[PDB]
Amino acid sequence: QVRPKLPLLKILHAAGAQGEMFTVKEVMHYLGQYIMVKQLYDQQEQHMVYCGGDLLGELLGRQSFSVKDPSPLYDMLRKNLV
Amino acid sequence: QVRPKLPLLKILHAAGAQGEMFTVKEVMHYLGQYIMVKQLYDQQEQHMVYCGGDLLGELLGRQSFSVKDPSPLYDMLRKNLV
Numbered sequence: 001q002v003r004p005k006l007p008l009l010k011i012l013h014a015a016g017a018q019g020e021m022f023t024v025k026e027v028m029h030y031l032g033q034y035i036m037v038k039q040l041y042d043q044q045e046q047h048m049v050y051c052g053g054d055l056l057g058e059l060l061g062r063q064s065f066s067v068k069d070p071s072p073l074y075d076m077l078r079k080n081l082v
Numbered sequence: 083q084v085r086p087k088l089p090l091l092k093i094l095h096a097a098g099a100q101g102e103m104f105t106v107k108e109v110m111h112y113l114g115q116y117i118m119v120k121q122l123y124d125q126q127e128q129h130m131v132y133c134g135g136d137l138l139g140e141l142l143g144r145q146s147f148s149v150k151d152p153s154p155l156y157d158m159l160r161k162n163l164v
């Protein structure tokens with residue numbers, strides 16, 4: 001089981017998660033939710049996430065990532081779920 | 083506002099919608115959910131919706147569409163709303 005730190009719960013909750021303990025599938029569904037509802041992906045680079053000045057970005061530290069290559073976010077997730 | 087038809091009413095509900103009437107975009111937005119959660123998009127081709135055999139397929143009439151060129155179910159709402 002995974003209890004994230006506040007900041008990511010923050011993206012997390014904000015995509016309608018509830019609570020503190022979680023799974024990794026679950027942590028991946030809400031971050032997807034978030035990107036989809038925040039509509040953060042690129043209308044023309046459909047796999048590219050643009051989260052400049054957006055709290056994901058904050059948490060990832062990049063302004064962009066590709067989902068076709070998800071590493072930098074794993075290193076977010078490798079970093080953030082206790 | 084729009085009265086979605088059962089077979090599209092089928093698909094909305096599958097991604098946790100409820101009711102009989104919905105706006106365009108909540109609607110636009112459940113399809114969004116159906117597709118995300120069911121992984122209808124191709125992981126390499128992310129703007130690409132691989133849906134044959136799925137309810138969505140035939141209701142689109144099809145086996146995919148380009149989420150860049152949505153006219154099939156922009157067309158499939160227009161005949162399935164309301």
Ligand SMILES: Cc1c(Cl)ccc2c(/C=C3\NC(=O)N(Cc4ccc(F)c(F)c4)C3=O)c[nH]c12
Pocket residue numbers: 031032033035036041042046047048049067110111113114117118128149150152155
């Ligand atoms: C990378 C990534 C993550 Cl993580 C999460 C969501 C997305 C994503 C989402 C969408 N692209 C799109 O065009 N729509 C609107 C849409 C809805 C239903 C239709 F049937 C339809 F044709 C069009 C989207 O929801 C594109 N990349 C993503």
Ligand SMILES: Cc1c(Cl)ccc2c(/C=C3\NC(=O)N(Cc4ccc(F)c(F)c4)C3=O)c[nH]c12
Pocket residue numbers: 028029031032033035036046049067068070073113114115117118123128129130131149
């Ligand atoms: C076209 C279209 C429609 Cl219509 C609806 C949804 C999508 C879509 C969604 C995803 N692609 C992806 O790789 N994930 C996983 C994911 C989870 C958490 C993250 F943080 C993340 F970066 C990536 C997705 O959820 C990609 N194209 C779509």
